[PDB]
Structures are given as C-alpha cells and as structure tokens.
Ligand binder design. Structure first.
Ligand SMILES: [Ca+2]
Ligand SMILES: [Ca+2]
Ligand SMILES: [Cl-]
Ligand SMILES: [Cl-]
Lengths: 208, 208
C-alpha cells in the first residue's frame, strides 16, 4: 500500500524510511533517474514540481514533512495528547529549518561555506539538547516517552551532521546518547546496516 | 487562554490572528520593539531565537506553523479525517515554501529581484488553483468542506501577493473567488477591516 518515489538518494526520504522500517511496515521504492527527471514530464505532474512523491493506496502526497505527519498520525507516532502533538510539531519544524540550511550548503556552497557552517552548528544543535534535558533528563525521546515522527527526522539530521562535521555532538551528551540509543532499536539497527540504506549516498551531488 | 508575542507587523502572525478572529477566539497581543529584540535577552529565551512565541494556558509554542497546526488540531480545523489532514498539511507546507521565497525577496533582494519574482509567480500560484479545481469545483475550501488552518495561511499569502503584484490572481478564477468569499466571512471581514490589522505594516522593513 506504500510507495516512495524519489531520486537514488537518502536525502529527504531517509527519516520516513527509518520510521517505516522501525515500525515493521513494508513499502515499495520507485527510483527516478536524473535523465527521467530532466525529460520533464514526471516533474510537470508533481504538485509543486518536486520529489518525494508518496502513495498510500490512492492517496498521493508531496512534501517530505507531510509524509512524516501522515505516517505519524496513522501509526500513532504523534504524542499522547494534543499538547504533546504540538511539541512534536515544534521539534519537526525546528529540524526542517536546520535541514534547509544543510541542503543549501550541500547544493550551493559546499567548498566555500562549510567552514562557516560547522562553526554556526553548535548554536543550531543546542535547542534540541535543551529539549532533551527538559524531557526526563534526555533518557527517552525528544517528546514524551513514546517515539514520534520528529524523532526519526531529528535522528537523521544528527546522523548526517556527524558525517559532515565528525564529533559535532561531543558538545552535546544527551544528543550523543540519543543517537546511539535510537540507532540500537532492533528493526532500525538492522535497516541502518542494510545495503538498501548503506549503498545510497546522502545527497545527489556526492557531497557530504 | 491565548497570548501572541511578536513584532508590530502582520508578517508570520497574520494567518493565525485571522484564524483566531474568524473562529471567535480571544487573545492578548504582547508587542516586541526593535530595541527590546536587539537588547537580546528575549531572543536568548526563544527556543530557536525567533518570534512568534505563543502561549496557550501553560503551553508555550514557537514556530508559526506549529501554532497554526495547534489551533487547527484543538479547534477542529484540520479536515474530516486522516486523508484530509494529510492534504491540509500538503497545502500548508506549499504555502510555507512560497512564503519563504516572498520573505527572501522582501528582506534581501527586493529592488533587483522583484521583476523575476513576479514573472515566476503564476507558476508558484498554479498549484493552489489546481487544488481548488479538484475540490468541489473550488466552491468550498482548499481541502474538504470545512475551513482548515491551511485556508487562513493560504488567504494571507494570497492577500500579500496582490499587494506585491496587483492583478496576480486575475488569470486564476478559483483563487480569485476563494479570496473574495473567505474575506467576506463576517468575523474575518470585521478583523481585516480593523485598525489592529489595517494599521500594521505587512513586513518589518516597510517593503511590500
Ligand atoms: Ca505511540
Ligand atoms: Ca471544523
Ligand atoms: Cl521555519
Ligand atoms: Cl518545503
């Protein structure tokens, strides 16, 4: 019933894939080549002219965070009540903002901008350390005591930043422990080690 | 029990205030000056160093789209079911993308950038016209048969684009009629007509 339509990349599909794997859900991957993409007709049929496209039976979705929220809702990964749901959105929106900066660097300014970016990174990572510290000493999840879609998205942003700036989480013991703890969940651990995850590059220009 | 904390501009709070007014809700406006913000300690206290900040009883939220989704969730402005909720998100995420482009023009590149922006604009508006055409001939709301938080956000975005590029909606009949019809909802009409709206500038730099 689920189909992910994307480039041969981790990118904006890494978090939703981790979620689906961790939750024991099956899905199909439909891969779009650069050639298919540049021919232009699939792009023309995309709502906002972008991928991922996601299919849930006859429901067609665009926008990676829409997909995340949809699976959160359907799979019960959206907090225990309405106040937790708001906190879950607040984290995800914050994650989305640092991801936009991360993509901008990768695409438009990797070589010249990297140095500056890695320097501003501690200040960008701190709110998430704070959020953990205020949630049972950072011992469980980013919101409440059950996993949410924001957890998968944050885990991913943190994995890719440790690739970009190895040791960037040394400054943040709760975020460091959170990564190890979430990465060690049985289904997720198995998925993160698999060729289907491992043999995809993070980004499409090979920069990371 | 609602408080809005923001600069004295429409900006990223216009949609949520429209929502609150149209839905018959009461709120407090806490204004923040340039000098208070530059003083630095309110900025330091914000989760992501940004306004708006929103209080709802003992709940404190940041991120305008978090606040919007929170009011949608708690006031029942989020579609009739999960499939609609997902379309609502997809609409709002689209509204957010174009708003980011708008802000970027207004704040960084208005004079040199405006021409290209207005030429690119029909392509950026066309998805929302299409979404209307596929939902009861564009006769009700952006999604389903009841108002959602995404309608308020879309309407704001459309209103500010008519100031920027007067006539931008002329080629779009469903978007044109939608703006007229939603703007005519009695509580919303009185709010858009009010001094607390009319006498605020759209953006902080006086450009529009
Ligand atoms: Ca759960
Ligand atoms: Ca309703
Ligand atoms: Cl944002
Ligand atoms: Cl987006």
């Amino acid at each position: 019933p689920y189909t992910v339509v994307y480039f041969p990349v981790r990118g904006r599909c890494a978090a939703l894939r981790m979620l689906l794997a961790d939750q024991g859900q099956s899905w199909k991957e439909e891969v779009v080549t650069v050639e298919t993409w540049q021919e232009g007709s699939l792009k023309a049929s995309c709502l906002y002219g972008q991928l991922p496209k996601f299919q849930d039976g006859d429901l067609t979705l665009y926008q990676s965070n829409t997909i995340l929220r949809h699976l959160g809702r359907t799979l019960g990964l959206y907090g225990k009540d309405q106040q937790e749901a708001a906190l879950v959105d607040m984290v995800n929106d914050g994650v989305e903002d640092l991801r936009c900066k991360y993509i901008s660097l990768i695409v438009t300014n990797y070589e010249a901008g990297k140095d500056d970016y890695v320097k501003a990174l501690p200040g960008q990572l701190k709110p998430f350390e704070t959020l953990l510290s205020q949630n049972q000493g950072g011992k469980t999840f980013i919101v409440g005591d059950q996993i949410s879609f924001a957890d998968y998205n944050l885990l991913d942003l943190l994995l890719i930043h440790e690739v970009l700036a190895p040791g960037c989480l040394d400054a943040f013991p709760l975020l460091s422990a959170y990564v190890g703890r979430l990465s060690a969940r049985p289904k997720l651990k198995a998925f993160l080690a698999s060729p289907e995850y491992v043999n995809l590059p993070i980004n499409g220009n090979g920069k990371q």
